[PDB]
A and B are shown apart, each in its own frame.
Chain A
Amino acid sequence: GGLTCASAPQGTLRILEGPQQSLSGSPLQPIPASPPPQIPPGLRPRFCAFG
C-alpha cells in the first residue's frame, strides 16, 4: 500500500447512450392543409323580383 505514482494513460474510453434513429429520417408527416372554401351545392335564386 505504498501508493506510488503510475505512468501516464494511453487513451480514453467514453461510454454514453446513443439515440435511436430508426424512427426519424422517415418522410415528414405535416399537418394536412385545410381545404379552400368551396361553393355549397344547391344554391338557387330564392329572390324573385316583385311584380
Chain B
Amino acid sequence: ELIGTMEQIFMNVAIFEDEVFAGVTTHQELFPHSLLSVIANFIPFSDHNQSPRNMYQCQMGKQ
C-alpha cells in the first residue's frame, strides 16, 4: 500500500516481523532500513556510528 504523510500519523506500522501484534499494527515497512536515503544507505554499519558522524559522511561522500 502507498500511504501518505497525513495518513501515516494514524497508522501503526511495524518495522520488524517480531513487532507485529494482532489488533494493534495495521501495516509494516518493506525493510527496516527504509527510513534512510539512497545516499545514507551507502554507509556501512551506520547503526553503530554516532549520528553526526553519519551526517558528515553524507556530506563528504558527495565531495
Spell out A's residues near B (CB within 8 Å). Answer: 27-28, 30-34
Contact = CB atoms under 8 A, between A and B. Distances in A.
Chain A's interface: helix, strand, loop or mixed, by majority? loop
A31 B22 CA distance: 14
Contact of A33 (B16, B22, B25): B16
Nearest to A34: B31
Chain B's interface: helix, strand, loop or mixed, by majority? loop
Contacts of A33: 16-18
A27 B22 contact: yes
Contacts of A28: 20, 22, 25
Contacts, number: 16
- Closest 7 A/B residue pairs (Cβ): A33-B17, A30-B20, A30-B28, A30-B17, A31-B28, A28-B22, A28-B20
Nearest to B20: A30
B43 to A, nearest CB: 18
B14 interface: yes
A45 B13 CA distance: 45
